[PDB]
């Protein structure tokens, strides 16, 4: 259940491309993945979900996984060619079919609680929110889940698998409790 154990878990259970992008994002925002090991795992998990979401004719542009400048450059380019309003906060994806940005949330807590937190932090009723748990639960803006049932099933399964792999190593309890502060 240690810090070293969690860092080792992350580097073993996530593909090297995900790990590298997560490390770069954490450094960009001033956090050390060797100290904030649960956050390291959280960023890898969330990045993987974004990449799995964008697979499932490229319907989706991935904003996440890019450095800050390139992320906003992509966002501005989309807004210039679609007239969609520029979001105040960086989103995770752009849906070319529905022509809307998407914010992806992954939570170790109840989805309704996290969904409210997300909706409150953005306040822009134009970014579509989609929350996943590690328990197979899901909540999205207007109960519009965007993807088909099978695509969401595989994301839920992968998240549950991560949870079980953590639990087998006694890492899940720590990971769960670090999402929200005291
Ligand atoms: O893109 C995100 C982001 C999300 O998209 C999200 O859903 C939750 C959280 N985020 N944050 C991610 C992040 C992403 C995934 C899981 C946990 C965290 S926790 C804060 C943090 C993030 C990235 C690097 C870092 F050092 C951080 F401390 C930051 C929020 O500022 C815009 C960029 N960003
Ligand atoms: Mn993001
Ligand atoms: Mn997100």
Numbering used by the authors: -4 to 51, 73 to 198
Question: What do the paper's sentences say?
Answer:
The heterotrimeric RNA-dependent RNA polymerase (RdRp) of influenza virus is composed of subunits PA, PB1 and PB2. It is responsible for replication and transcription of the segmented, single-stranded viral RNA genome (vRNA) in the nucleus of infected cells.
To verify the reduced endonuclease activity of the I38T mutant, we purified the isolated endonuclease domain from influenza A and B virus polymerase with either Ile or Thr at position 38. For influenza A, we used residues 1–198 from strain A/California/04/2009 (pH1N1) with truncation of the flexible loop (Δ52–64:Gly), as previously described. All four PA-BXA co-crystal structures exhibit clear and unambiguous electron density for the compound, which is bound in essentially the identical fashion in each structure. When this residue is mutated to the more polar threonine, the structure is essentially unchanged in both the FluA and FluB structures except for the side-chain of the residue. The side-chain of T38 is orientated such that its methyl-group is in exactly the same position as the CG1 of Ile38, whereas the OH group is orientated towards helix α3 allowing it to make two hydrogen bonds to the main-chain carbonyl oxygens of Met34 and Leu35. Thus, substitution of Ile38 by Thr38 reduces slightly the van der Waals interaction with the compound since threonine lacks the CD1 methyl group of isoleucine. Furthermore, unlike I38, which does not change conformation upon BXA binding, T38 (and M34 in the case of FluB) have to change rotamer to accommodate the inhibitor binding. The results show a 10-fold reduced activity of the I38T mutant endonuclease in vitro for both FluA and FluB (black triangles). Although I38T mutation confers reduced sensitivity to BXA, we also show that recombinant influenza A viruses bearing this mutation have a significantly reduced fitness in canine and human cells, as measured by growth curves.
